[PDB]
């Protein structure tokens, strides 16, 4: 009924690689240095995240939205670490295997075409980037819960997401902005990543307090998001004939509408994206 209605906003893979770098990186970039490019800018977004992981030799990391594999790689490469990605993509499934099984190492690697709800076994440390917006809110108790649960008592996991505001978080100009951004969201969660449902930043942090977890103060990457949105949109936009052979002349508006309206609206402060650390009890100083 749902996963019938839902197919219609299905983009081939042809098309985004017409707007992402190198990589397939479908996730905001770190400019750090401000003079990388978008790719070298997606590498040095995955060291953020694997940075604050307190990641050590022979450890188990479990990146939940696995995505094309670029973090698992990185994590095996920099860490010598065991991995083991979630993805509900086939595609992403099998190039991930691929990927994994590429690297000159003897560290497991396993990749599962399931989600976090299906996956109880012990892992160290978790990364998940930009896959906790698909979740729903009435599952992010079980999600901190279930990530809780799976680490040791040193464990520490990352969360990278997009962001909205509630309406009473916000002073006059926001409360007025809120009617635009909100049409503009249900725009997104209908037709760009149908099914999706944007937290807040303290939503985020909450959740992950009621868990047990410490939370330091979320990182916000809301300049980087917009230099992201910028490079994607303008690439987009150089690529509008290849684009629209692809797919068509709707999807390719529907796209760049998404892209710039993105643009618009994380400069404007109505959307940020959180990267929010989550630290068990017994996580080394
Ligand atoms: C996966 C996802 C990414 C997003 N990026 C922005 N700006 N909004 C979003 C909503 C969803 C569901
Ligand atoms: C390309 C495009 C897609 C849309 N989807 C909704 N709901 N409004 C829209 C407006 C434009 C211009």
Redo the contacts with the bound molecule.
Sequence with gaps: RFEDIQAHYDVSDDFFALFQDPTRTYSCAYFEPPELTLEEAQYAKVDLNLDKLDLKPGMTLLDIGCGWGTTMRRAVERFDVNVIGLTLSKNQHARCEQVLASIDTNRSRQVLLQGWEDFAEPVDRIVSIEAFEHFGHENYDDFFKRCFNIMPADGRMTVQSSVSYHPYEMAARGKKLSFETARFIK?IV??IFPGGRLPSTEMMVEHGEKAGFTVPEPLSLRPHYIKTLRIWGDTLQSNKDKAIEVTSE?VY??YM?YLRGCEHYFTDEMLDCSLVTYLKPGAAA
Aim: net charge neutral; aromatic share 14%.
């Design positions: 725009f209908t037709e709707e508006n529907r509408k």
